[PDB]
Structure 1
Amino acid sequence: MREIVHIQAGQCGNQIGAKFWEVISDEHGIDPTGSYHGDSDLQLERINVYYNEATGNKYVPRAILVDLEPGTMDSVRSGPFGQIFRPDNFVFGQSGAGNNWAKGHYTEGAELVDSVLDVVRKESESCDCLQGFQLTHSLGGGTGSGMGTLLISKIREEYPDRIMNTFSVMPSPKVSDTVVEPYNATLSVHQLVENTDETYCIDNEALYDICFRTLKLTTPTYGDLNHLVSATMSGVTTCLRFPGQLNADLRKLAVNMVPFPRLHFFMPGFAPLTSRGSQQYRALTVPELTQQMFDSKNMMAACDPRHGRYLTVAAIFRGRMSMKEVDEQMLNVQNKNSSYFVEWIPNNVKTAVCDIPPRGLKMSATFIGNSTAIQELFKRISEQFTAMFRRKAFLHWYTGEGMDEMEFTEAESNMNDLVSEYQQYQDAT
């Protein structure tokens, strides 16, 4: 019951999920080969949320790996965790995406999506009672953006009532490593609006900032930033897999995170984050963890909450903890900072408490915020977009691939309308 299909898409999608199924595969004591080597029978009661048991107690995930380039697949196969996936789930083309949206959504994506939805139906027809899906992908890539939004817009036609959420990486102007990532991000924000139930917006600068300031790292790679992100994605569905005192599925969050439809862009947050060495000097508690979660410097989205108001938040704690301290800390926050909350919603916070912490510490927590300050993201992109597009730069690589202008102007307007949706719900009483 309550299975989750994992569709990691693109290059970025595969890197995160590579590290994602290295965490989950530790949560449940899965061997690299696929056998089970746990001790506690909590690890197995709800293993089936992610893993198909196969013949002779091997555990094959329900993940589908999609790419338009053979490379990432060959890396994953040849690595520590190649053994863990089913080889019919490594679905990939040959001709690269171009870091071009048109090329992954119309030309070379449509060719492949038939051979992938046929793998979605291998997974969906085997489940007892499916709950949801998930992309892991990148707004700013070819396959992450384009092919991802082709997969999504073809699942709503098949499975129109399952919680489909994305962990999408969004561009930041301070750190650019692709010239047309405004073009590629604009045309996919357009698709995520109408098609998705929850969207966890993650940036790059926000992850260095955690590494530098909080964790006291020296030299971060993609390897390190997605290792964080995977500890968030584990937290989301903890109460789906572990027993808790308050439970919270995918659907439970969705329901009371999202005031209006369409405003389904969340800001995660993790706590605790210490350096090694500076762990014997923080006392690890619930007021300690709450103060980090309401800190700006522990947002994995490169914004400051202080430039708006949280509509709603959720607080997912993992550990042997109290309920008074939880119910109090979550109270003392929305009193002391009552101008940082939307006031037409009483009790902006939802708490959930699991019983099972991560496999090195006690008392973690995970903050998921629906803040109005996320329009700071959508405007920084729609300024770069409108500065290139007024010249019509880089246009022939897009009109060459089946698109035209009128897909742009509408997609620019769909991004600029929801800036005026966070804006309405920040102010006006």
Structure 2
Amino acid sequence: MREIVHIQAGQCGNQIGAKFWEVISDEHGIDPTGSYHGDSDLQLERINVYYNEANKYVPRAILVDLEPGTMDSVRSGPFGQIFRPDNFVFGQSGAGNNWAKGHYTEGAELVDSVLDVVRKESESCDCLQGFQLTHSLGGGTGSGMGTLLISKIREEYPDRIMNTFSVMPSPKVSDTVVEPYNATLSVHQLVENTDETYCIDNEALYDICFRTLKLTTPTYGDLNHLVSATMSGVTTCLRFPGQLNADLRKLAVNMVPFPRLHFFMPGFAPLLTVPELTQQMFDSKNMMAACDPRHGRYLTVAAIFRGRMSMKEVDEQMLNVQNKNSSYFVEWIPNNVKTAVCDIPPRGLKMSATFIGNSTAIQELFKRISEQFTAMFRRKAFLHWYTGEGMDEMEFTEAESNMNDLVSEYQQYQDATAD
């Protein structure tokens, strides 16, 4: 079929990736041992996209880390042994929440063994569409090693699609002060080397856990259930029989008007009625970024509706959201909101709506990181941890410069008219 290759790098990466494999393995009727046990045939029709077949099924996944902890955790836990044991690739050193270490020194040791497993999976594919990477941008392994992998893989498969779920750092969720540096460095890489990045901002997941789910003390599991829900959502049209945006590439084509602006904002409901699903979905209190879309303009949007409902209601409500708030949709990309429906709902819910936005409000997120970066950089603070691995401020200077440029571009198009 059209095969995706999935990569988990780092702690956060392997955590959200393991949850994602649990969630969609359930959706597709795959027990923790790799045996199909579901009713519908619609669960196995496109199962080739995310699973190799061995009567058993094995996630086409590659698990990567510079420390053995999180990956042991994964081998041990739920669906722990659905993964090909060969595909665990791990060092012992760790990366010390250091971008330079994952990208230049420790990651460089491990990267060739990763690429080895990557070749093995890619060359067992009829038609490889591309690669999907999960990682945070705030630590060291995921951030730096992941971006290094992105480059390596592009070098070897320059014609395939690079796709990442990249977790953006937020003070309210961590403490590692350098996170802005790490993030600004990998945003740099991502601007250049991915076709589509879902921006999962920890800030928003926090807020939605706190001030909506009303969880006063959220754990990383609380955030990661929002994350795995989103990932199922944005992978539905790829995992189940359907049409609109079914390939990573068609997705790229229908969502990326200009090659740099490929940073998407996901949203999900219910965190009902087609109206309730639709309005919740488009509200900010359901965005997984932090930006308010009412602050910028939708360039492109794709909505997925899962469950049994009326497509007539879905079309009416979708056009109602646009026609009503037609101010927040650019007029130089006609008919830029597409909608798909899949009958199979996520676990536990009978109806659900996921949403993917190329919105200029994403500038807010980059702006936030930019600020945090400059605070420290204006006094060269904590730079020693990096300079010592062989880096030069120019690099930081370039990365900050590139991200400022990204923000400036998102603003320009937001302020563009047709006539």
Encode CA deviations 1:282-310: one digit per residue, 9 max, x unaligned.
xx221111111111100010121121111
Q: CA deviation at 1:73?
A: 1.4
8 Å contact kept, 2:22–2:78: no
* Secondary structure, counterpart of 1:153 in structure 2: helix
Where do 1:5-404 residues align within 5 Å?
5-54=5-54, 57-244=55-242, 246=244, 248-273=246-271, 284-404=272-392
**Unmatched tracts of structure 1, length 5 or more:** 274-283
Q: CA deviation at 1:130?
A: 1.1
CA distance in 2, matches of 1:152, 1:247: 23
- Structure 1 stretches of 4+ with a deviation exceeding 6 A read none
CA distance in 1, matches of 2:331, 2:308: 32
Q: CA deviation at 1:245?
A: 6.5
* Secondary structure, counterpart of 2:327 in structure 1: coil
Q: CA deviation at 1:219?
A: 3.9
8 Å contact kept, 2:45–2:241: no
Change (3 A) 1:92 1:152: same
Q: Using structure 2 for the length normalisation, give the TM-score.
A: 0.96
Q: CA deviation at 1:335?
A: 1.7
Q: Using structure 1 for the length normalisation, give the TM-score.
A: 0.93
Judge which range, 309-318 or 118-127, deviates more: 309-318
* Secondary structure, counterpart of 2:156 in structure 1: coil
Encode CA deviations 1:408-428: one digit per residue, 9 max, x unaligned.
111111011111101101113
CA distance in 2, matches of 1:172, 1:61: 31
8 Å contact kept, 1:245–1:353: no
CA distance in 2, matches of 1:144, 1:41: 36
Q: CA deviation at 1:268?
A: 0.1
CA distance in 2, matches of 1:386, 1:241: 41
CA distance in 2, matches of 1:246, 1:255: 12
8 Å contact kept, 1:14–1:136: yes
Judge which range, 91-100 or 203-212, deviates more: 203-212
CA distance in 2, matches of 1:64, 1:176: 26
Encode CA deviations 1:232-267: one digit per residue, 9 max, x unaligned.
111222122222375633223221211111000000
Judge which range, 33-42 or 287-296, deviates more: 33-42
CA distance in 1, matches of 2:71, 2:172: 30
- Please give the root-mean-square deviation of Cα atoms over the aligned residues, in Å: 1.6
Judge which range, 98-107 or 23-32, deviates more: 23-32
Q: CA deviation at 1:16?
A: 0.5
Change (3 A) 1:202 1:323: same
Q: CA deviation at 1:71?
A: 0.8
8 Å contact kept, 1:271–1:364: yes
Q: CA deviation at 1:78?
A: 1.8
Change (3 A) 1:122 1:415: same
* Secondary structure, counterpart of 1:132 in structure 2: strand
Judge which range, 19-28 or 262-271, deviates more: 19-28
CA distance in 2, matches of 1:168, 1:190: 13
8 Å contact kept, 2:46–2:241: no
Change (3 A) 1:245 1:128: closer
Judge which range, 116-125 or 239-248, deviates more: 239-248
Change (3 A) 1:32 1:146: same
Q: CA deviation at 1:80?
A: 2.4
CA distance in 1, matches of 2:134, 2:157: 18
CA distance in 2, matches of 1:163, 1:228: 25
Work out the number of aligned pairs and report it. 417
8 Å contact kept, 1:270–1:365: yes
8 Å contact kept, 1:319–1:354: yes
Q: CA deviation at 1:320?
A: 2.8
Q: CA deviation at 1:211?
A: 2.2
Q: CA deviation at 1:22?
A: 0.7
More helix by share: 2
Change (3 A) 1:245 1:122: closer
* Secondary structure, counterpart of 1:238 in structure 2: helix
CA distance in 2, matches of 1:412, 1:88: 38
Change (3 A) 1:173 1:291: same
Q: CA deviation at 1:214?
A: 3.4
Judge which range, 144-153 or 161-170, deviates more: 161-170
Q: CA deviation at 1:405?
A: 1.4
8 Å contact kept, 2:243–2:340: yes
* Secondary structure, counterpart of 2:190 in structure 1: helix
* Secondary structure, counterpart of 1:201 in structure 2: strand
**Unmatched tracts of structure 2, length 5 or more:** none
Judge which range, 109-118 or 73-82, deviates more: 73-82
Judge which range, 58-67 or 320-329, deviates more: 320-329
